Amino acid sequence: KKKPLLPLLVAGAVLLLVILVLGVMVAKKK
């Protein structure tokens, strides 16, 4: 019933480098 989190672990990692890091460009520049 419960969906595996194996692919979710790496999923959040990608969003951390692609999305989160995207905001650091404007943040650090601020």
Side-chain angles (χ1 to χ4, degrees):
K1 301 180 67 60
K2 297 294 180 61
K3 186 72 71 61
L5 288 72
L6 299 177
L8 282 68
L9 297 176
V10 300
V14 180
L15 305 174
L16 194 155
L17 280 299
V18 72
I19 295 172
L20 196 64
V21 181
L22 205 163
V24 322
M25 298 301 299
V26 58
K28 299 181 181 300
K29 182 179 292 181
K30 186 187 183 66

PDB file of all heavy atoms in Angstrom:
ATOM      1  N   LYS A   1       0.843  -1.222   0.000  1.00  0.00           N
ATOM      2  CA  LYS A   1       0.000   0.000   0.000  1.00  0.00           C
ATOM      3  C   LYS A   1       0.866   1.256   0.000  1.00  0.00           C
ATOM      4  O   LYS A   1       0.700   2.137  -0.843  1.00  0.00           O
ATOM      5  CB  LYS A   1      -0.921   0.005   1.222  1.00  0.00           C
ATOM      6  CG  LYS A   1      -1.844  -1.203   1.291  1.00  0.00           C
ATOM      7  CD  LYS A   1      -2.745  -1.153   2.516  1.00  0.00           C
ATOM      8  CE  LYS A   1      -3.746  -0.012   2.428  1.00  0.00           C
ATOM      9  NZ  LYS A   1      -4.629  -0.139   1.237  1.00  0.00           N
ATOM     10  N   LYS A   2       1.792   1.328   0.951  1.00  0.00           N
ATOM     11  CA  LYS A   2       2.688   2.474   1.067  1.00  0.00           C
ATOM     12  C   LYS A   2       3.689   2.502  -0.084  1.00  0.00           C
ATOM     13  O   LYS A   2       4.296   1.485  -0.420  1.00  0.00           O
ATOM     14  CB  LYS A   2       3.432   2.431   2.405  1.00  0.00           C
ATOM     15  CG  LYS A   2       2.518   2.536   3.615  1.00  0.00           C
ATOM     16  CD  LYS A   2       1.845   3.897   3.690  1.00  0.00           C
ATOM     17  CE  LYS A   2       0.939   4.006   4.906  1.00  0.00           C
ATOM     18  NZ  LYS A   2       1.692   3.843   6.179  1.00  0.00           N
ATOM     19  N   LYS A   3       3.858   3.678  -0.684  1.00  0.00           N
ATOM     20  CA  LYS A   3       4.787   3.848  -1.797  1.00  0.00           C
ATOM     21  C   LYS A   3       6.226   3.966  -1.286  1.00  0.00           C
ATOM     22  O   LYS A   3       6.496   4.734  -0.364  1.00  0.00           O
ATOM     23  CB  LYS A   3       4.419   5.095  -2.603  1.00  0.00           C
ATOM     24  CG  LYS A   3       5.246   5.276  -3.869  1.00  0.00           C
ATOM     25  CD  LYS A   3       4.863   4.265  -4.940  1.00  0.00           C
ATOM     26  CE  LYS A   3       3.491   4.562  -5.524  1.00  0.00           C
ATOM     27  NZ  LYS A   3       3.441   5.905  -6.166  1.00  0.00           N
ATOM     28  N   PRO A   4       7.173   3.207  -1.881  1.00  0.00           N
ATOM     29  CA  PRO A   4       8.582   3.247  -1.471  1.00  0.00           C
ATOM     30  C   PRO A   4       9.156   4.658  -1.515  1.00  0.00           C
ATOM     31  O   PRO A   4       8.776   5.465  -2.364  1.00  0.00           O
ATOM     32  CB  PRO A   4       9.283   2.352  -2.498  1.00  0.00           C
ATOM     33  CG  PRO A   4       8.217   1.453  -3.014  1.00  0.00           C
ATOM     34  CD  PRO A   4       6.949   2.260  -2.990  1.00  0.00           C
ATOM     35  N   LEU A   5      10.074   4.950  -0.598  1.00  0.00           N
ATOM     36  CA  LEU A   5      10.692   6.268  -0.533  1.00  0.00           C
ATOM     37  C   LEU A   5      12.107   6.242  -1.103  1.00  0.00           C
ATOM     38  O   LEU A   5      12.803   7.257  -1.098  1.00  0.00           O
ATOM     39  CB  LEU A   5      10.725   6.775   0.913  1.00  0.00           C
ATOM     40  CG  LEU A   5       9.371   7.197   1.492  1.00  0.00           C
ATOM     41  CD1 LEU A   5       8.491   5.984   1.753  1.00  0.00           C
ATOM     42  CD2 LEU A   5       9.567   8.000   2.769  1.00  0.00           C
ATOM     43  N   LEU A   6      12.523   5.079  -1.599  1.00  0.00           N
ATOM     44  CA  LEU A   6      13.857   4.927  -2.174  1.00  0.00           C
ATOM     45  C   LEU A   6      14.136   5.997  -3.235  1.00  0.00           C
ATOM     46  O   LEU A   6      15.169   6.664  -3.182  1.00  0.00           O
ATOM     47  CB  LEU A   6      14.031   3.527  -2.772  1.00  0.00           C
ATOM     48  CG  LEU A   6      13.896   2.370  -1.778  1.00  0.00           C
ATOM     49  CD1 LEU A   6      14.019   1.036  -2.497  1.00  0.00           C
ATOM     50  CD2 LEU A   6      14.942   2.484  -0.679  1.00  0.00           C
ATOM     51  N   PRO A   7      13.227   6.182  -4.219  1.00  0.00           N
ATOM     52  CA  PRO A   7      13.412   7.186  -5.271  1.00  0.00           C
ATOM     53  C   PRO A   7      13.148   8.603  -4.771  1.00  0.00           C
ATOM     54  O   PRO A   7      13.585   9.578  -5.383  1.00  0.00           O
ATOM     55  CB  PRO A   7      12.383   6.785  -6.325  1.00  0.00           C
ATOM     56  CG  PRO A   7      11.294   6.125  -5.553  1.00  0.00           C
ATOM     57  CD  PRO A   7      11.961   5.436  -4.392  1.00  0.00           C
ATOM     58  N   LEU A   8      12.428   8.710  -3.657  1.00  0.00           N
ATOM     59  CA  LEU A   8      12.109  10.007  -3.072  1.00  0.00           C
ATOM     60  C   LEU A   8      13.330  10.612  -2.385  1.00  0.00           C
ATOM     61  O   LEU A   8      13.468  11.832  -2.309  1.00  0.00           O
ATOM     62  CB  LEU A   8      10.956   9.877  -2.072  1.00  0.00           C
ATOM     63  CG  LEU A   8       9.561   9.768  -2.694  1.00  0.00           C
ATOM     64  CD1 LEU A   8       9.403   8.450  -3.438  1.00  0.00           C
ATOM     65  CD2 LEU A   8       8.488   9.910  -1.624  1.00  0.00           C
ATOM     66  N   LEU A   9      14.211   9.751  -1.884  1.00  0.00           N
ATOM     67  CA  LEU A   9      15.421  10.206  -1.207  1.00  0.00           C
ATOM     68  C   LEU A   9      16.319  10.978  -2.167  1.00  0.00           C
ATOM     69  O   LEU A   9      16.827  12.049  -1.835  1.00  0.00           O
ATOM     70  CB  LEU A   9      16.187   9.018  -0.618  1.00  0.00           C
ATOM     71  CG  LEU A   9      15.444   8.236   0.466  1.00  0.00           C
ATOM     72  CD1 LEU A   9      16.256   7.026   0.903  1.00  0.00           C
ATOM     73  CD2 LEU A   9      15.140   9.131   1.658  1.00  0.00           C
ATOM     74  N   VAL A  10      16.511  10.426  -3.360  1.00  0.00           N
ATOM     75  CA  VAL A  10      17.343  11.062  -4.372  1.00  0.00           C
ATOM     76  C   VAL A  10      16.598  12.208  -5.047  1.00  0.00           C
ATOM     77  O   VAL A  10      17.210  13.146  -5.558  1.00  0.00           O
ATOM     78  CB  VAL A  10      17.802  10.052  -5.442  1.00  0.00           C
ATOM     79  CG1 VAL A  10      18.614   8.934  -4.807  1.00  0.00           C
ATOM     80  CG2 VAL A  10      16.606   9.490  -6.196  1.00  0.00           C
ATOM     81  N   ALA A  11      15.269  12.126  -5.044  1.00  0.00           N
ATOM     82  CA  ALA A  11      14.436  13.155  -5.652  1.00  0.00           C
ATOM     83  C   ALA A  11      14.636  14.498  -4.959  1.00  0.00           C
ATOM     84  O   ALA A  11      14.895  15.512  -5.609  1.00  0.00           O
ATOM     85  CB  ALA A  11      12.973  12.747  -5.602  1.00  0.00           C
ATOM     86  N   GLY A  12      14.514  14.496  -3.634  1.00  0.00           N
ATOM     87  CA  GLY A  12      14.690  15.718  -2.872  1.00  0.00           C
ATOM     88  C   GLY A  12      16.089  16.285  -3.005  1.00  0.00           C
ATOM     89  O   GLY A  12      16.286  17.496  -2.918  1.00  0.00           O
ATOM     90  N   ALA A  13      17.063  15.404  -3.215  1.00  0.00           N
ATOM     91  CA  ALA A  13      18.451  15.823  -3.363  1.00  0.00           C
ATOM     92  C   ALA A  13      18.635  16.675  -4.613  1.00  0.00           C
ATOM     93  O   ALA A  13      19.297  17.712  -4.579  1.00  0.00           O
ATOM     94  CB  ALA A  13      19.367  14.609  -3.410  1.00  0.00           C
ATOM     95  N   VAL A  14      18.041  16.230  -5.718  1.00  0.00           N
ATOM     96  CA  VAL A  14      18.138  16.953  -6.981  1.00  0.00           C
ATOM     97  C   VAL A  14      17.516  18.340  -6.867  1.00  0.00           C
ATOM     98  O   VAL A  14      18.062  19.316  -7.379  1.00  0.00           O
ATOM     99  CB  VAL A  14      17.449  16.183  -8.125  1.00  0.00           C
ATOM    100  CG1 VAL A  14      17.549  16.957  -9.431  1.00  0.00           C
ATOM    101  CG2 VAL A  14      18.053  14.795  -8.274  1.00  0.00           C
ATOM    102  N   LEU A  15      16.372  18.418  -6.195  1.00  0.00           N
ATOM    103  CA  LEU A  15      15.678  19.687  -6.014  1.00  0.00           C
ATOM    104  C   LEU A  15      16.493  20.633  -5.139  1.00  0.00           C
ATOM    105  O   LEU A  15      16.345  21.851  -5.219  1.00  0.00           O
ATOM    106  CB  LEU A  15      14.300  19.454  -5.386  1.00  0.00           C
ATOM    107  CG  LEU A  15      13.396  18.475  -6.142  1.00  0.00           C
ATOM    108  CD1 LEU A  15      12.126  18.206  -5.351  1.00  0.00           C
ATOM    109  CD2 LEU A  15      13.059  19.016  -7.523  1.00  0.00           C
ATOM    110  N   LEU A  16      17.355  20.062  -4.307  1.00  0.00           N
ATOM    111  CA  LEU A  16      18.195  20.854  -3.416  1.00  0.00           C
ATOM    112  C   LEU A  16      19.295  21.558  -4.203  1.00  0.00           C
ATOM    113  O   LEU A  16      19.658  22.693  -3.902  1.00  0.00           O
ATOM    114  CB  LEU A  16      18.805  19.957  -2.333  1.00  0.00           C
ATOM    115  CG  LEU A  16      19.425  20.692  -1.140  1.00  0.00           C
ATOM    116  CD1 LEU A  16      19.431  19.800   0.092  1.00  0.00           C
ATOM    117  CD2 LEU A  16      20.840  21.148  -1.467  1.00  0.00           C
ATOM    118  N   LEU A  17      19.823  20.878  -5.213  1.00  0.00           N
ATOM    119  CA  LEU A  17      20.888  21.438  -6.035  1.00  0.00           C
ATOM    120  C   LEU A  17      20.342  22.309  -7.167  1.00  0.00           C
ATOM    121  O   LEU A  17      20.965  23.297  -7.551  1.00  0.00           O
ATOM    122  CB  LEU A  17      21.759  20.318  -6.615  1.00  0.00           C
ATOM    123  CG  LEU A  17      22.811  19.738  -5.662  1.00  0.00           C
ATOM    124  CD1 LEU A  17      23.793  20.815  -5.225  1.00  0.00           C
ATOM    125  CD2 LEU A  17      22.148  19.095  -4.451  1.00  0.00           C
ATOM    126  N   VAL A  18      19.186  21.936  -7.708  1.00  0.00           N
ATOM    127  CA  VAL A  18      18.590  22.682  -8.814  1.00  0.00           C
ATOM    128  C   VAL A  18      17.741  23.875  -8.350  1.00  0.00           C
ATOM    129  O   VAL A  18      17.930  24.993  -8.829  1.00  0.00           O
ATOM    130  CB  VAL A  18      17.746  21.761  -9.725  1.00  0.00           C
ATOM    131  CG1 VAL A  18      16.458  21.345  -9.046  1.00  0.00           C
ATOM    132  CG2 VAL A  18      17.459  22.443 -11.056  1.00  0.00           C
ATOM    133  N   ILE A  19      16.810  23.639  -7.425  1.00  0.00           N
ATOM    134  CA  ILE A  19      15.920  24.696  -6.943  1.00  0.00           C
ATOM    135  C   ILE A  19      16.546  25.557  -5.844  1.00  0.00           C
ATOM    136  O   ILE A  19      16.708  26.766  -6.014  1.00  0.00           O
ATOM    137  CB  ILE A  19      14.590  24.106  -6.426  1.00  0.00           C
ATOM    138  CG1 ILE A  19      13.813  23.467  -7.578  1.00  0.00           C
ATOM    139  CG2 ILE A  19      13.752  25.184  -5.747  1.00  0.00           C
ATOM    140  CD1 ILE A  19      12.592  22.692  -7.132  1.00  0.00           C
ATOM    141  N   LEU A  20      16.887  24.937  -4.717  1.00  0.00           N
ATOM    142  CA  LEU A  20      17.462  25.660  -3.584  1.00  0.00           C
ATOM    143  C   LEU A  20      18.651  26.524  -4.005  1.00  0.00           C
ATOM    144  O   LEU A  20      18.731  27.698  -3.642  1.00  0.00           O
ATOM    145  CB  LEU A  20      17.889  24.684  -2.486  1.00  0.00           C
ATOM    146  CG  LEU A  20      18.156  25.317  -1.117  1.00  0.00           C
ATOM    147  CD1 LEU A  20      16.881  25.920  -0.547  1.00  0.00           C
ATOM    148  CD2 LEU A  20      18.733  24.286  -0.160  1.00  0.00           C
ATOM    149  N   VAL A  21      19.570  25.942  -4.767  1.00  0.00           N
ATOM    150  CA  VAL A  21      20.753  26.666  -5.225  1.00  0.00           C
ATOM    151  C   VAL A  21      20.381  27.808  -6.167  1.00  0.00           C
ATOM    152  O   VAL A  21      21.120  28.782  -6.297  1.00  0.00           O
ATOM    153  CB  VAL A  21      21.749  25.724  -5.928  1.00  0.00           C
ATOM    154  CG1 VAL A  21      22.992  26.481  -6.375  1.00  0.00           C
ATOM    155  CG2 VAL A  21      22.124  24.574  -5.007  1.00  0.00           C
ATOM    156  N   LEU A  22      19.236  27.688  -6.827  1.00  0.00           N
ATOM    157  CA  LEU A  22      18.782  28.719  -7.754  1.00  0.00           C
ATOM    158  C   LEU A  22      18.485  30.021  -7.011  1.00  0.00           C
ATOM    159  O   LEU A  22      18.693  31.112  -7.541  1.00  0.00           O
ATOM    160  CB  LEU A  22      17.533  28.242  -8.505  1.00  0.00           C
ATOM    161  CG  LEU A  22      17.296  28.886  -9.875  1.00  0.00           C
ATOM    162  CD1 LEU A  22      16.316  28.055 -10.690  1.00  0.00           C
ATOM    163  CD2 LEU A  22      16.780  30.309  -9.723  1.00  0.00           C
ATOM    164  N   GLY A  23      18.011  29.898  -5.775  1.00  0.00           N
ATOM    165  CA  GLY A  23      17.682  31.071  -4.983  1.00  0.00           C
ATOM    166  C   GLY A  23      18.891  31.694  -4.306  1.00  0.00           C
ATOM    167  O   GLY A  23      18.834  32.843  -3.869  1.00  0.00           O
ATOM    168  N   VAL A  24      19.983  30.942  -4.211  1.00  0.00           N
ATOM    169  CA  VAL A  24      21.197  31.448  -3.573  1.00  0.00           C
ATOM    170  C   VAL A  24      21.856  32.525  -4.428  1.00  0.00           C
ATOM    171  O   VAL A  24      22.582  33.376  -3.917  1.00  0.00           O
ATOM    172  CB  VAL A  24      22.211  30.319  -3.291  1.00  0.00           C
ATOM    173  CG1 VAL A  24      21.489  29.061  -2.843  1.00  0.00           C
ATOM    174  CG2 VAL A  24      23.082  30.046  -4.509  1.00  0.00           C
ATOM    175  N   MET A  25      21.603  32.477  -5.732  1.00  0.00           N
ATOM    176  CA  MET A  25      22.170  33.454  -6.652  1.00  0.00           C
ATOM    177  C   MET A  25      21.664  34.854  -6.328  1.00  0.00           C
ATOM    178  O   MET A  25      22.430  35.819  -6.328  1.00  0.00           O
ATOM    179  CB  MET A  25      21.820  33.091  -8.096  1.00  0.00           C
ATOM    180  CG  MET A  25      22.381  31.748  -8.539  1.00  0.00           C
ATOM    181  SD  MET A  25      24.178  31.666  -8.411  1.00  0.00           S
ATOM    182  CE  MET A  25      24.659  32.975  -9.534  1.00  0.00           C
ATOM    183  N   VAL A  26      20.369  34.955  -6.054  1.00  0.00           N
ATOM    184  CA  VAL A  26      19.754  36.234  -5.723  1.00  0.00           C
ATOM    185  C   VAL A  26      19.936  36.558  -4.242  1.00  0.00           C
ATOM    186  O   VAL A  26      19.979  37.725  -3.851  1.00  0.00           O
ATOM    187  CB  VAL A  26      18.252  36.231  -6.066  1.00  0.00           C
ATOM    188  CG1 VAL A  26      17.538  35.119  -5.315  1.00  0.00           C
ATOM    189  CG2 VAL A  26      17.625  37.584  -5.761  1.00  0.00           C
ATOM    190  N   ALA A  27      20.047  35.515  -3.423  1.00  0.00           N
ATOM    191  CA  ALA A  27      20.224  35.685  -1.986  1.00  0.00           C
ATOM    192  C   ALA A  27      21.594  36.272  -1.669  1.00  0.00           C
ATOM    193  O   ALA A  27      21.698  37.350  -1.084  1.00  0.00           O
ATOM    194  CB  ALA A  27      20.039  34.356  -1.268  1.00  0.00           C
ATOM    195  N   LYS A  28      22.644  35.553  -2.055  1.00  0.00           N
ATOM    196  CA  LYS A  28      24.011  36.003  -1.815  1.00  0.00           C
ATOM    197  C   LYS A  28      24.249  37.388  -2.415  1.00  0.00           C
ATOM    198  O   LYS A  28      24.953  38.212  -1.832  1.00  0.00           O
ATOM    199  CB  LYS A  28      25.009  35.004  -2.406  1.00  0.00           C
ATOM    200  CG  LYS A  28      24.903  33.610  -1.808  1.00  0.00           C
ATOM    201  CD  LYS A  28      25.927  32.666  -2.417  1.00  0.00           C
ATOM    202  CE  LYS A  28      25.802  31.264  -1.841  1.00  0.00           C
ATOM    203  NZ  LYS A  28      26.004  31.250  -0.366  1.00  0.00           N
ATOM    204  N   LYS A  29      23.657  37.634  -3.579  1.00  0.00           N
ATOM    205  CA  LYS A  29      23.808  38.917  -4.261  1.00  0.00           C
ATOM    206  C   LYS A  29      23.116  40.037  -3.488  1.00  0.00           C
ATOM    207  O   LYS A  29      23.515  41.198  -3.573  1.00  0.00           O
ATOM    208  CB  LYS A  29      23.239  38.834  -5.679  1.00  0.00           C
ATOM    209  CG  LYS A  29      23.398  40.120  -6.476  1.00  0.00           C
ATOM    210  CD  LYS A  29      22.848  39.977  -7.887  1.00  0.00           C
ATOM    211  CE  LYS A  29      23.683  39.018  -8.722  1.00  0.00           C
ATOM    212  NZ  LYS A  29      23.163  38.892 -10.111  1.00  0.00           N
ATOM    213  N   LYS A  30      22.076  39.680  -2.739  1.00  0.00           N
ATOM    214  CA  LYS A  30      21.325  40.658  -1.956  1.00  0.00           C
ATOM    215  C   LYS A  30      22.230  41.352  -0.941  1.00  0.00           C
ATOM    216  O   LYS A  30      22.408  40.802   0.166  1.00  0.00           O
ATOM    217  CB  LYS A  30      20.158  39.978  -1.238  1.00  0.00           C
ATOM    218  CG  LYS A  30      19.241  40.945  -0.508  1.00  0.00           C
ATOM    219  CD  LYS A  30      18.202  40.207   0.319  1.00  0.00           C
ATOM    220  CE  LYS A  30      17.233  41.170   0.987  1.00  0.00           C
ATOM    221  NZ  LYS A  30      16.396  41.894  -0.010  1.00  0.00           N
TER     222      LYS A  30
END
